[PDB]
């Protein structure tokens, strides 16, 4: 059962880029659901203030990647993916920001990739608005934590 926590430091600088209307598109390191297992990564966007309807949102997508075990694994990928922006306050006062989605084997995002990262990602264009970050302690020590849990 694959779990990866993506640590995005220097977050204030990424927010400043977004405020200055400079694109911010970043990718997590690749991580495996198991060994053997699938290789995946996360893609995060800070949508620009001038974007069409999703301005000032965090977008969060998952991508399949070419992994060492791909020849031994069934395709298309099927399973459940939980994406969470972690609330970094203490346990009694904490509420993470979370979505859970089922992979859709019919989509090209979940077929076996032919290049290092599958260009089709699957996720949330409007995962979390930037202003929602200010309501709880999501940023701590200039770091956002993005957790991805994958079932089968």
């Amino acid at each position: 059962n694959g779990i990866y926590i993506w640590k995005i430091g220097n977050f204030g600088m990424h927010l400043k880029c977004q405020e200055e209307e400079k694109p911010v598109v970043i990718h997590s390191p690749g991580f495996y659901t198991g060994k053997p297992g699938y290789k995946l990564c996360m893609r995060l966007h800070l949508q620009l203030p001038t974007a069409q309807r999703c301005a000032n949102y965090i977008s969060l997508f998952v991508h399949t990647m070419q992994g060492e075990y791909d020849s031994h694994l069934p395709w298309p990928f099927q399973g459940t993916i939980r994406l969470t922006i972690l609330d970094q306050s203490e346990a009694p006062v904490r509420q993470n920001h979370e979505e859970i989605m089922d992979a859709k084997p019919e989509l090209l995002a979940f077929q076996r990739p032919t290049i290092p990262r599958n260009p089709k990602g699957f996720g949330y264009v409007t995962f979390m608005h930037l202003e929602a970050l200010r309501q709880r302690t999501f940023i701590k020590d200039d770091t956002l934590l993005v957790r991805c849990e994958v079932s089968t």
Binding site: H63, E99, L107, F122, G123, Y124
Partner: peptide, 11 residues
């Protein structure tokens, strides 16, 4: 509230 497929090359 619902997930979608997006191409990282903007189409």
């Amino acid at each position: 509230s619902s997930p979608t497929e997006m191409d990282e090359n903007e189409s």
